[PDB]
Amino acid sequence: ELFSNQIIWFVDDTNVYRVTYHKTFEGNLTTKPINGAIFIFNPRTGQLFLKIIHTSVWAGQKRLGQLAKWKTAEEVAALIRSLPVEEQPKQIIVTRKGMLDPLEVHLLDFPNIVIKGSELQLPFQACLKVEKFGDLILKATEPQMVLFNLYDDWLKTISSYTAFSRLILILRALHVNNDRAKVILKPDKTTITEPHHIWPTLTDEEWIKVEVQLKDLILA
Ligand SMILES: [Cl-]
Ligand SMILES: [Cl-]
Ligand SMILES: [Mg+2]
């Protein structure tokens, strides 16, 4: 499975094609695309490749929902081609089944790479309301890739499996109730997030309490 000898990426395409709806004064529907992102995530190291997708790519094109899956597959292949072979993933796990065929067709030059689907709940969409990603995506004027470390300094003291489990609880809790999750994640008036970190600096005891509360929020 995960946390072995091989490089694994999760790929989430959920947030690539995003639109806002508006009812005009004339009573018609406008559907305006807004910038999206592909999340490509290494659960062992915490590395996130955030590929920001600028609305220009949609041009005057149709069925943008299906096309978006192909755009995602194109970008994953482009990233793989830009990496030395030793940094290429051995397995790619797609969070949505619609990515299986587009990725299969785009990765035919990489017979070493195993593609599979998943039933895991890994809502990277929660990141769109984490200010550090949200504004970056909103304000982009062209496509670009940005690297992050989603585990902050956790791996100094906990294993990759432990870090992944904490991250998933954070994302799922933010997804199900953003406002309440943010309160849970700020236990003290003194609680801060370092400028180069994504998540707060909490004591070991604070994390125990937070992990239980996040889980309960998800169960609710
Ligand atoms: Cl799908
Ligand atoms: Cl890019
Ligand atoms: Mg390395």
CSV table of C-alpha atoms and ligand atoms in Angstrom, one decimal:
chain,number,residue,atom,x,y,z
A,1,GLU,CA,0.0,0.0,0.0
A,2,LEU,CA,1.1,3.5,0.9
A,3,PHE,CA,4.3,4.2,2.9
A,4,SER,CA,6.6,1.6,1.3
A,5,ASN,CA,9.4,1.8,-1.1
A,6,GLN,CA,7.5,3.3,-4.0
A,7,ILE,CA,6.5,6.9,-4.9
A,8,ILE,CA,2.8,7.3,-4.8
A,9,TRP,CA,0.7,10.3,-5.9
A,10,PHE,CA,-2.9,11.1,-5.2
A,11,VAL,CA,-4.5,13.1,-8.0
A,12,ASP,CA,-7.6,15.2,-7.3
A,13,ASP,CA,-9.2,16.8,-10.4
A,14,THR,CA,-12.4,17.9,-8.6
A,15,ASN,CA,-11.4,21.6,-8.5
A,16,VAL,CA,-10.1,22.0,-12.1
A,17,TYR,CA,-13.3,23.3,-13.7
A,18,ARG,CA,-15.1,25.8,-11.5
A,19,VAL,CA,-18.0,28.1,-12.4
A,20,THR,CA,-20.1,30.6,-10.7
A,21,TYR,CA,-23.7,31.1,-11.5
A,22,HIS,CA,-25.6,34.4,-11.8
A,23,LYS,CA,-29.2,35.2,-12.5
A,24,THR,CA,-29.1,38.4,-14.7
A,25,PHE,CA,-31.6,41.3,-14.5
A,26,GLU,CA,-33.2,39.8,-17.7
A,27,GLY,CA,-33.7,36.5,-15.9
A,28,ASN,CA,-31.1,34.4,-17.7
A,29,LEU,CA,-28.3,32.3,-16.4
A,30,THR,CA,-24.7,33.3,-16.8
A,31,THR,CA,-22.1,30.6,-16.1
A,32,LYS,CA,-18.7,32.2,-15.6
A,33,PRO,CA,-15.6,30.0,-15.2
A,34,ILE,CA,-13.2,30.9,-12.3
A,35,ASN,CA,-9.7,29.6,-11.8
A,36,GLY,CA,-9.2,26.0,-10.7
A,37,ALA,CA,-6.4,23.8,-9.6
A,38,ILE,CA,-5.2,20.2,-9.8
A,39,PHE,CA,-3.9,18.8,-6.5
A,40,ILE,CA,-1.1,16.2,-6.9
A,41,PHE,CA,-0.1,14.9,-3.5
A,42,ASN,CA,2.7,12.6,-2.2
A,43,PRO,CA,1.4,11.1,1.1
A,44,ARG,CA,4.8,9.9,2.3
A,45,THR,CA,6.6,13.2,2.0
A,46,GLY,CA,3.8,15.7,2.2
A,47,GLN,CA,4.7,17.2,-1.1
A,48,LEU,CA,1.9,19.0,-3.0
A,49,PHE,CA,2.2,20.1,-6.6
A,50,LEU,CA,-0.6,22.6,-7.1
A,51,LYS,CA,-1.2,23.2,-10.8
A,52,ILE,CA,-3.3,26.3,-11.1
A,53,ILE,CA,-5.7,26.3,-14.0
A,54,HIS,CA,-6.4,29.7,-15.5
A,55,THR,CA,-9.8,30.3,-17.1
A,56,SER,CA,-8.3,31.1,-20.5
A,57,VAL,CA,-7.8,27.4,-21.2
A,58,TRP,CA,-11.5,27.0,-21.6
A,59,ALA,CA,-11.5,29.4,-24.5
A,60,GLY,CA,-14.9,29.1,-26.4
A,61,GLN,CA,-14.9,25.3,-25.8
A,62,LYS,CA,-17.9,23.0,-24.8
A,63,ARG,CA,-18.6,20.3,-22.2
A,64,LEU,CA,-15.9,21.7,-20.1
A,65,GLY,CA,-16.6,19.2,-17.3
A,66,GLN,CA,-15.4,16.3,-19.5
A,67,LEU,CA,-12.7,18.3,-21.2
A,68,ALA,CA,-11.4,19.2,-17.7
A,69,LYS,CA,-10.6,15.5,-17.0
A,70,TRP,CA,-8.5,15.4,-20.1
A,71,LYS,CA,-6.8,18.7,-19.2
A,72,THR,CA,-5.9,17.2,-15.8
A,73,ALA,CA,-4.4,14.1,-17.5
A,74,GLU,CA,-2.4,16.3,-19.9
A,75,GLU,CA,-1.0,18.2,-16.9
A,76,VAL,CA,-0.1,15.1,-14.9
A,77,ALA,CA,1.8,13.7,-17.9
A,78,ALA,CA,3.5,17.1,-18.4
A,79,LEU,CA,4.7,17.1,-14.8
A,80,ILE,CA,5.9,13.5,-15.0
A,81,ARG,CA,7.9,14.4,-18.2
A,82,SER,CA,9.5,17.3,-16.4
A,83,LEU,CA,10.8,15.1,-13.6
A,84,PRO,CA,13.8,12.8,-13.6
A,85,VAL,CA,12.8,9.2,-13.9
A,86,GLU,CA,13.8,8.5,-10.3
A,87,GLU,CA,11.3,11.2,-9.1
A,88,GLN,CA,8.4,9.8,-11.2
A,89,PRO,CA,5.6,8.1,-9.3
A,90,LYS,CA,5.2,4.3,-9.5
A,91,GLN,CA,1.5,4.5,-8.7
A,92,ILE,CA,-1.1,7.2,-9.2
A,93,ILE,CA,-4.3,7.0,-7.3
A,94,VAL,CA,-7.1,9.1,-8.7
A,95,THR,CA,-9.8,10.4,-6.3
A,96,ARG,CA,-12.5,10.3,-9.0
A,97,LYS,CA,-13.2,7.5,-11.4
A,98,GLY,CA,-13.6,9.8,-14.4
A,99,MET,CA,-9.8,10.4,-14.4
A,100,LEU,CA,-9.0,6.7,-15.0
A,101,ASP,CA,-9.4,6.6,-18.8
A,102,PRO,CA,-7.9,10.0,-19.6
A,103,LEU,CA,-4.9,9.3,-17.5
A,104,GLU,CA,-4.5,5.8,-19.0
A,105,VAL,CA,-4.4,7.3,-22.5
A,106,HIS,CA,-2.0,10.1,-21.5
A,107,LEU,CA,0.5,7.8,-19.7
A,108,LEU,CA,1.1,5.2,-22.5
A,109,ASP,CA,4.8,6.2,-22.6
A,110,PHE,CA,5.1,5.3,-18.9
A,111,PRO,CA,4.5,1.6,-18.7
A,112,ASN,CA,6.0,1.5,-15.2
A,113,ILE,CA,3.2,3.6,-13.7
A,114,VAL,CA,0.2,1.9,-12.2
A,115,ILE,CA,-3.1,3.9,-12.3
A,116,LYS,CA,-5.9,3.0,-9.9
A,117,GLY,CA,-9.0,4.6,-8.4
A,118,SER,CA,-10.0,5.0,-4.8
A,119,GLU,CA,-13.0,5.2,-2.5
A,120,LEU,CA,-11.1,7.4,-0.1
A,121,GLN,CA,-12.5,10.7,1.0
A,122,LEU,CA,-9.7,13.2,0.4
A,123,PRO,CA,-11.4,16.5,-0.2
A,124,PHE,CA,-8.6,18.8,-1.4
A,125,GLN,CA,-11.5,21.2,-2.3
A,126,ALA,CA,-11.3,22.2,1.4
A,127,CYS,CA,-8.0,23.9,0.5
A,128,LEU,CA,-9.8,26.5,-1.6
A,129,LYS,CA,-10.9,28.1,1.7
A,130,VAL,CA,-7.5,27.9,3.3
A,131,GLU,CA,-6.4,31.5,2.6
A,132,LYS,CA,-2.9,30.6,1.4
A,133,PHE,CA,-4.3,28.5,-1.5
A,134,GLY,CA,-7.6,30.3,-2.0
A,135,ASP,CA,-6.3,33.8,-2.9
A,136,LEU,CA,-3.4,32.3,-4.9
A,137,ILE,CA,-5.8,30.4,-7.1
A,138,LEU,CA,-8.4,33.2,-7.3
A,139,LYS,CA,-5.9,35.9,-8.4
A,140,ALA,CA,-3.7,33.9,-10.9
A,141,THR,CA,-3.6,35.5,-14.4
A,142,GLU,CA,-2.0,32.5,-16.1
A,143,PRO,CA,-1.4,28.8,-15.4
A,144,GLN,CA,1.5,27.9,-13.1
A,145,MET,CA,2.7,25.3,-10.7
A,146,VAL,CA,3.4,25.9,-7.0
A,147,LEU,CA,5.0,23.5,-4.6
A,148,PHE,CA,4.0,23.1,-0.9
A,149,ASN,CA,4.7,20.8,2.0
A,150,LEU,CA,1.3,19.9,3.5
A,151,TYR,CA,2.8,18.4,6.7
A,152,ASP,CA,4.6,21.6,7.9
A,153,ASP,CA,7.2,20.4,10.5
A,154,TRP,CA,5.3,17.3,11.6
A,155,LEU,CA,7.6,14.7,10.2
A,156,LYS,CA,10.3,15.8,12.7
A,157,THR,CA,8.3,14.1,15.4
A,158,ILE,CA,5.7,11.8,13.7
A,159,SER,CA,5.6,9.2,11.0
A,160,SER,CA,4.3,9.8,7.4
A,161,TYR,CA,1.3,7.5,8.2
A,162,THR,CA,0.5,9.6,11.3
A,163,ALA,CA,0.9,12.9,9.3
A,164,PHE,CA,-1.4,11.6,6.5
A,165,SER,CA,-4.1,10.6,9.0
A,166,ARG,CA,-3.9,14.1,10.7
A,167,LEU,CA,-4.1,15.9,7.2
A,168,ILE,CA,-7.1,13.8,6.1
A,169,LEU,CA,-9.0,14.7,9.3
A,170,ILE,CA,-8.2,18.4,8.8
A,171,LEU,CA,-9.3,18.4,5.1
A,172,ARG,CA,-12.5,16.4,5.8
A,173,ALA,CA,-13.5,18.5,8.8
A,174,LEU,CA,-12.9,21.8,6.8
A,175,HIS,CA,-14.9,20.3,4.0
A,176,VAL,CA,-17.9,19.3,6.1
A,177,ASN,CA,-18.0,22.4,8.3
A,178,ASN,CA,-15.4,25.0,7.5
A,179,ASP,CA,-16.3,27.5,10.1
A,180,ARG,CA,-16.3,25.0,13.0
A,181,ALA,CA,-13.2,23.3,11.8
A,182,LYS,CA,-11.3,26.6,11.8
A,183,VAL,CA,-12.4,27.3,15.4
A,184,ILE,CA,-11.3,23.8,16.5
A,185,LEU,CA,-7.9,24.5,14.8
A,186,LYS,CA,-7.5,27.7,16.8
A,187,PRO,CA,-7.6,26.5,20.5
A,188,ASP,CA,-5.8,29.4,22.1
A,189,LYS,CA,-5.9,33.2,21.5
A,190,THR,CA,-2.1,32.8,21.0
A,191,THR,CA,-2.5,30.1,18.3
A,192,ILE,CA,-0.6,31.0,15.2
A,193,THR,CA,0.4,29.6,11.8
A,194,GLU,CA,4.0,30.3,10.7
A,195,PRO,CA,4.2,32.3,7.4
A,196,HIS,CA,5.7,29.3,5.6
A,197,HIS,CA,3.4,26.8,7.2
A,198,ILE,CA,-0.1,25.9,6.2
A,199,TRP,CA,-1.5,24.6,9.5
A,200,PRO,CA,-1.3,26.0,13.1
A,201,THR,CA,1.5,25.5,15.5
A,202,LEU,CA,-0.1,23.3,18.3
A,203,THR,CA,1.4,21.5,21.2
A,204,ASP,CA,1.2,17.7,21.2
A,205,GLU,CA,-1.7,17.8,23.8
A,206,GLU,CA,-3.5,20.3,21.6
A,207,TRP,CA,-3.2,18.0,18.6
A,208,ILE,CA,-4.7,15.1,20.5
A,209,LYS,CA,-7.8,17.2,21.4
A,210,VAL,CA,-8.0,18.7,17.9
A,211,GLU,CA,-7.9,15.2,16.2
A,212,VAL,CA,-10.7,13.9,18.4
A,213,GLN,CA,-12.8,17.1,17.7
A,214,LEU,CA,-12.2,16.9,13.9
A,215,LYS,CA,-13.2,13.3,13.8
A,216,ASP,CA,-16.4,14.1,15.8
A,217,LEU,CA,-17.2,16.9,13.3
A,218,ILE,CA,-16.8,14.5,10.4
A,219,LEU,CA,-19.1,11.9,12.2
A,220,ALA,CA,-21.7,14.6,12.7
B,1,CL,CL,-15.7,11.5,-12.0
B,2,CL,CL,1.9,24.5,-14.7
B,3,MG,MG,14.2,12.2,-3.4
